[PDB]
Design a protein around this ligand. Structure first.
Ligand SMILES: NC(=O)c1ccc[n+]([C@@H]2O[C@H](COP(=O)([O-])OP(=O)(O)OC[C@H]3O[C@@H](n4cnc5c(N)ncnc54)[C@H](OP(=O)(O)O)[C@@H]3O)[C@@H](O)[C@H]2O)c1
Length: 314
């Protein structure tokens, strides 16, 4: 699905549109403001993805402000933030959003996501010590997030890093189902299982770490590079276009102006079926972001391995 032009977009269940390409901001650092302004004003991005836990929201805010002061309406932008683990209790949801909106210098978010489906204690360590991973009242948290929508502070709500079982648990109790499920997706980790479950429920999927992140960057993968040279495009452009053809929005992160400009030029051309199949053919070995260092305590639990974080669905 698409919108057409570099204004390509997907449609959420609420009728609101999400631009197909967004700017990621994890580890964007003290360049964040510049990258956000450049991406929006010069490269024509209309979607920014951030989070409180990234520590860059104030910077994103200054960037968004500068971009809008140059004659772009707030309505045209799509801003996503995320509710962190330590704030996953009903009475912490609203204060967390207000802080995010204040740092971003906004009055509403377009999308507010559960960052991870795990509650952490205040002052939790990495890895977490005994009793620092707490019990999650998912139903109560989600009810409060529905209230944010009702008040108009958030236009849509959703989740990240979910399993099929956790999705079913949420879908049982929810009045407003999740608009978006944001997941690690790239060649080498398709996660078709979660994608199919989201497709069934009409939930839109955003591919995070679409280039394999910093840790396992795929821009010098032999197969990706072969396709890139064949089509006269960059490896990044191929990786991102591959995702759009699967039907997921993408949020590639870069702090370099030229890469920011490149990453959105993924419309008006396609990856042929043979090349698409070859990239899908890369085996799903391992994920870059396991959540092990955030939630796994091997000795005391309650989560003693990475497979327990993903409900044994790998
Ligand atoms: N929900 C979650 O839990 C979650 C988890 C991970 C990520 N995310 C979100 O998704 C966004 C993207 O994921 P990610 O930041 O992990 O990684 P990514 O976008 O897959 O990869 C970014 C890395 O590739 C480089 N890069 C960017 N464009 C390139 C190109 N055209 N050619 C070659 N290299 C390129 C970047 O370096 P330079 O910056 O130096 O250009 C950076 O090192 C994050 O910023 C965040 O918004 C969410």
């Amino acid at each position: 699905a698409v919108g057409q032009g570099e204004r390509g977009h997907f449609v959420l269940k609420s009728g609101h549109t999400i631009p197909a390409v967004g700017l990621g901001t994890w580890r964007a650092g003290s360049d964040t403001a510049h990258s956000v302004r450049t991406a929006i004003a010069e490269a024509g991005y209309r979607h920014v993805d951030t989070a409180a836990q990234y520590g860059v929201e104030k910077e994103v805010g200054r960037g968004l402000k500068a971009a809008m002061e140059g004659g772009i309406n707030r309505k045209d932008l799509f801003v996503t933030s995320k509710l962190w683990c330590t704030e996953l209790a009903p009475d912490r949801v609203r204060p967390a959003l207000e802080k995010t909106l204040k740092d971003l210098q906004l009055d509403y978010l377009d999308l507010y996501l559960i960052h991870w489906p795990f509650r952490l204690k205040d002052g939790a360590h990495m890895p977490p010590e005994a009793g620092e991973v707490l019990e999650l009242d998912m139903e109560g948290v989600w009810r409060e997030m529905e209230g944010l929508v009702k008040d108009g502070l958030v236009k849509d709500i959703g989740v990240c890093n979910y399993t099929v079982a956790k999705l079913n648990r949420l879908m049982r109790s929810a009045n407003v189902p999740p608009a978006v499920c944001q997941m690690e997706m790239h060649p080498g980790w398709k996660n078709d299982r979660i994608f199919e479950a989201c497709k069934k429920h009409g939930i839109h999927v955003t591919a995070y770490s679409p280039l394999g992140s910093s840790e396992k960057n795929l821009a010098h993968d032999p197969l990706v590079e072969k396709v890139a040279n064949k089509l006269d495009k960059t490896p990044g452009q191929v990786l991102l276009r591959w995702a759009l053809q699967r039907g997921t929005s993408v949020i590639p992160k870069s702090t370099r102006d030229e890469r920011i400009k490149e990453n959105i030029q993924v419309f008006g051309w396609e990856i042929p079926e043979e090349d698409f199949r070859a990239l899908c053919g890369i085996k799903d070995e391992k994920r870059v972001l396991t959540g092990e260092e955030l939630f796994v305590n091997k000795t005391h639990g309650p989560y003693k391995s990475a497979t327990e974080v993903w409900d044994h669905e790998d």
